[PDB]
Each structure stands twice: as C-alpha cells, then as structure tokens.
Amino acid sequence: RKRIHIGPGRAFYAT
C-alpha cells in the first residue's frame, strides 16, 4: 500500500 501525500510545501510517500 503506497501512500502519496502532495500539498503546498511538502510531498512524500509513506510506507
């Protein structure tokens, strides 16, 4: 389960 978080100032993918 790949988690993709994109928003102003931050971007990452939680395990």
Partner: antibody, heavy 129, light 112 residues
C-alpha cells in the same frame, strides 16, 4: 457560511516588519492545514507558507525562510504570519487559505492531495523606501 | 527547471468556447493528477474551480472543464458569458520545493 478574514497589512520600509492575522469561522479550524498565499500587483499567485493542524510542522517558500514565521492558535481560530526583514519584492496582497484533502484511494495506493478551497479577501502589504 | 506557463491573456465572444493552456505541469506518475485551476475577479479573492485535473467543486458550472495530456493542462469554458471575464490561474505539482506552483495567470476578456 465559511469565512476567513485577515488583517495587519500596511506600509513599511525595507527591513521593517508586520504581523498578519486571519480569523476563521464556520468550520472546524483545527482539522485543516492553513496557508498564506500572496499576489504582487498585476501578477500571479504564490504560496508563502502553511502549518499542519497540530501547529508543529511548518513549511515556507525559500525566499522567506528565516524572515517569516507562521503560527496558529486553535483556541481562537486564528492563523498568524510574522514578517521580518521585509523587502520591496515582498510587496503584495496576502491571502490566508484553507487546504482541503482530496482523497482518492485505489487500494494498492492512494492519493492525498491538498488544494485551497477557502480564501479570505486579503490584506495589503507595501514595502517601499 | 520548472514554471507553469499560461498565456497572459485570451479573448472570446458570448456563446463561444475558449481554452487556456498551461504547460510545465508534472509528468511524474505520482503527481500527474495534481492539477487545479482558480478563478479570480478583479479585486476579489481566488476561487477553486477545478482540482485533480478535472473535478468540479459543487456550485461550479459544468461549463468549466479540465483536461490534461503530457505536461500540458487545459481549462475549457463553453458558452462564454459576460461574467466569465476574470483571471484564471493554473496550479500544479512539481517534484521540488515549493512542490506546488502557480502559472502567471490568464486574463480572459469577453468581448461585450
């Protein structure tokens, strides 16, 4: 209805400082990330800074890191922005906006995207020598 | 390395359709879908009208639609009305700080 009202704008000289306020109403403030976006006369928009719902995680655009400090007080539905070492290029209208989560889950993975759905009317900041 | 590009201005007459392009959005598969558009009337605050490339917040007219192919995002307005006259800004993801960009904005004029 949902509303956001900022204040604190004004005229200062290079190196001066200002403290912007933003009062929310009509929504659970401590559930959303809050941002500050600016617009220089006759130009487009530019995100300046935001803060997580727990007030810890803070992000800024590179040109203001060190000079600008964002903070919030969930107790009073308020968002703030302390501006120090102001420059001429910082001249613009400042808006505070709410970041909302657009969640789309496809099991193996999911997208958690944030966009600004609520905006205040904006407060003016002029920096001139 | 990154900067969204939308024409400074566009015109159209009542009843027609018009399109505003925005090159430079992300082609990264994980950020491809992060695209939005905001409408802004002179002196007023922006308003989200399209997010996730082509979704509409409730209340926004189905005359406004969004699409994307390659790195180019496109906003389309059909049956132009005098009240459609405003500034339109595209927003998109970018793999590096600040992660979310804005175009220069497009001034749409409705020849009234």
């Amino acid at each position: 209805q949902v509303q956001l009202v900022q204040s604190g704008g004004g005229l200062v000289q290079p190196g001066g400082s200002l403290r912007l306020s933003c009062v929310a109403s009509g929504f659970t403030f401590n559930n959303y990330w809050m941002s500050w976006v600016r617009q220089a006369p006759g130009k487009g928009l530019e995100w300046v800074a935001n803060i997580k719902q727990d007030g810890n995680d803070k992000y800024y655009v590179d040109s203001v890191k060190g000079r600008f400090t964002i903070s919030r007080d969930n107790a009073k539905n308020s968002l703030f922005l302390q501006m120090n070492s102001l420059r001429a290029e910082d001249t613009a209208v400042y808006f505070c906006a709410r970041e909302f989560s657009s969640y789309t889950d496809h099991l193996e993975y999911y997208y958690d995207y944030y966009y600004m759905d609520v905006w205040g009317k904006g407060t003016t900041v002029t920096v001139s020598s | 390395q990154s900067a969204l590009t939308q024409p400074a201005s566009v015109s159209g007459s009542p009843g027609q359709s018009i399109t505003i392009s925005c090159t430079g959005t992300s082609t990264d598969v994980n950020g491809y879908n992060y695209v939005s558009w905001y409408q802004q009337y002179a002196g007023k605050a922006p308003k989200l009208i399209i997010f996730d490339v082509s979704k509409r917040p409730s209340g926004v007219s189905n005359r406004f639609s969004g699409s994307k192919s390659g790195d180019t995002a496109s906003l389309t307005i059909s049956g132009l009305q005098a009240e459609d006259e405003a500034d339109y800004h595209c927003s998109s993801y970018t793999s590096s700080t600040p992660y979310v960009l804005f175009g220069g904005g497009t001034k749409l004029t409705v020849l009234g």
